[PDB]
Design a protein around this ligand. Sequence first.
Ligand SMILES: [Fe+3]
Ligand SMILES: [Fe+3]
Length: 222
Amino acid sequence: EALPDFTSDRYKDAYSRINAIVIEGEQEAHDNYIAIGTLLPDHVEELKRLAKMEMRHKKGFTACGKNLGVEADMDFAREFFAPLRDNFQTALGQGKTPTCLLIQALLIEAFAISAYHTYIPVSDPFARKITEGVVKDEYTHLNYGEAWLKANLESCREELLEANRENLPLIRRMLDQVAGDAAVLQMDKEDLIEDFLIAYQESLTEIGFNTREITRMAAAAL
Ligand SMILES: [Fe+3]
Ligand SMILES: [Fe+3]
């Protein structure tokens, strides 16, 4: 729990990768909400609003890197998201709204929430304020996904179980891949996992899944 030395070569190196992941994630989130507008034309003005929030998030996190004198490793970041991005693209192409929403509005928003929650107490004063701004918006995004999936659950149960089976392991893999750099940032991987699972389980509960269903799903991470 002691704060890192934000000025060290060790810290900056780790930050170059973690910062890039966040910046790429925010851009992809923008792109994803806009793409979901093609599937839900009647939601376009709300999705545009969510997409605009993501660009604000991206600008803020970009400024966090600049503030520490770090250059973001964007190639690393693009590779990091590729497996999940490919799955989102595949679902979009097939018109699989429930899967697109599970990927972006549940899994990724829960991952971000957990990351940002865990980062705040060990963040530098500039980044801390930016990150504290963003976490409220994550709940808005989660709530948007939750509401649509809740309203449509009975037509998409099976697809959501499939989407979870395929994509939850990818979040696990991402956590495994980021954990070393996150530890340099004084973030405990066990905190990241706990917060992610709590957020995701709470979203599934809101949508209408029962305890047994959620347990069977969280297990897919296997
Ligand atoms: Fe965001
Ligand atoms: Fe978001």
